[PDB]
């Protein structure tokens, strides 16, 4: 919804702290949150 960098990192840190509270470990260098790029089970797609 909101395009603001100061409030997006509050969202992204809350994701990685929730997955760390769930016992598991996520990696920031592999987890992607990006609009125009979708990958799903070794199937890559970019900009349609």
């Amino acid at each position: 919804h909101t395009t603001d960098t100061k409030v997006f990192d509050k969202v992204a840190a809350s994701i990685f702290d929730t997955v760390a509270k769930c016992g598991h470990e996520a990696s920031p260098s592999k987890t992607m949150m990006t609009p125009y790029s979708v990958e799903k089970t070794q199937t890559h797609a970019k900009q349609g």
Binding site: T3, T5, P28, T34, K46
Partner: protein, 96 residues
């Protein structure tokens, strides 16, 4: 290829395994963030998991997220992916 074959030479099965994650991430963040963005238009059902997609022409739109990428997330992700290369190439400097 020639710069990558030299790098993955002195230990192929460990260096190629660790270079895989920065290579796949680099393509998957290539086009996003540029100010004019060209897409391929398509429309389907109102579900996001609709498979009945038909396609249209190309068009170039302005990017609504052109300022979001100067955040603390995307600057840390590209800096960590550089270190995974830099830990890998410095391992090959010592071996060969």
């Amino acid at each position: 290829l020639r710069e990558f074959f030299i790098l993955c030479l002195p230990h192929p099965k460990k260096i190629n395994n660790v270079l895989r994650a920065p290579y796949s991430w680099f393509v998957k963040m290539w086009g996003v963030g540029a100010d004019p963005i060209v897409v391929l238009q398509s429309t389907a059902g109102d579900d996001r998991n609709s498979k009945d997609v038909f396609y249209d022409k190309f068009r170039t739109e302005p990017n609504r997220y052109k300022a979001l990428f100067r955040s603390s997330f995307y600057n840390e992700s590209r800096r960590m992916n550089e270190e995974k290369i830099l830990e890998a190439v410095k391992y090959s400097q010592k071996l060969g």
